[PDB]
Design an enzyme around this catalytic site. Structure first.
Site, mmCIF file in Angstrom:
data_model
loop_
_atom_site.group_PDB
_atom_site.id
_atom_site.type_symbol
_atom_site.label_atom_id
_atom_site.label_comp_id
_atom_site.label_asym_id
_atom_site.label_seq_id
_atom_site.Cartn_x
_atom_site.Cartn_y
_atom_site.Cartn_z
ATOM 1 N N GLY A 285 0.803 -1.244 0.000
ATOM 2 C CA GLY A 285 0.000 0.000 0.000
ATOM 3 C C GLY A 285 0.816 1.264 0.000
ATOM 4 O O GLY A 285 0.458 2.291 -0.601
ATOM 5 N N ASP A 286 1.918 1.213 0.708
ATOM 6 C CA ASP A 286 2.774 2.344 0.790
ATOM 7 C C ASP A 286 3.358 2.698 -0.589
ATOM 8 O O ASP A 286 3.399 3.881 -0.941
ATOM 9 C CB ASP A 286 3.861 2.018 1.803
#
Lengths: 125, 125
Positions: free
Chosen positions: B19-20
């Protein structure tokens, strides 16, 4: 993602800026897909693959396969010349990053997947 | 990207890991699209938006809009509890990162674009 007007006019560093993030998503996705699952595992794995040295080595490899088209060659030239890292490794990694950025922004999705898979084949091994 | 088998079983850190990176591509693309073009400009801009403090503040904001569905709430709970950064900011940013990772891996493309746009609206302003 929306089209960015005159994205193909972007300088090498601006193309390398998006390309570097794109490469990181592909590499992280690859490592998850391989069934790695532990944090200290995955970060050690991806930093190794995404490092400037490793992107330089990847690009050299792909050049000897004569992987690229003339349009892509021109974008690599743009990245390599864009004005604790070695000068030549910086230039080649920035070249590779600019091409990924370019392919992504120009929405050449099939070619980008092809190129990254090849890059990841070599860079993991 | 290929489907990853049992991707929804992934722990919070593994979801936050993809996600980062996903958030970074969206944010960098956003800044290019706004017509920023200078290196020291773009990196200052994106590091500000993608920082843990700023992702914590974004998530708080979105919680007060009651943005999320119950399924997404469960994924945020998973990220917040996944075992110079503050403890609470770490927990909330990891929660936000895990949800983006989840939406991406589960191929909820429309919802992910919606969520990130909202996040970027707030995080830029």
């Amino acid at each position: 993602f929306d089209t960015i007007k005159d994205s193909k006019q972007l300088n090498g560093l601006a193309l390398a800026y998006i390309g570097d993030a794109i490469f990181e998503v592909y590499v992280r996705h690859h490592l998850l897909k391989q069934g790695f699952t532990k944090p200290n595992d995955l970060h050690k794995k991806s930093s190794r693959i995404v490092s400037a040295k490793s992107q330089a080595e990847i690009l050299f490899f792909l050049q000897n396969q004569s992987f690229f088209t003339e349009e892509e060659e021109a974008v690599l030239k743009r990245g390599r010349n864009a004005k604790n890292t070695d000068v030549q490794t910086y230039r080649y990694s920035t070249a590779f990053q600019a091409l990924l950025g370019y392919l992504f922004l120009e929405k050449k999705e099939e070619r980008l997947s092809q190129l990254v898979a090849e890059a990841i084949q070599f860079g993991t091994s």
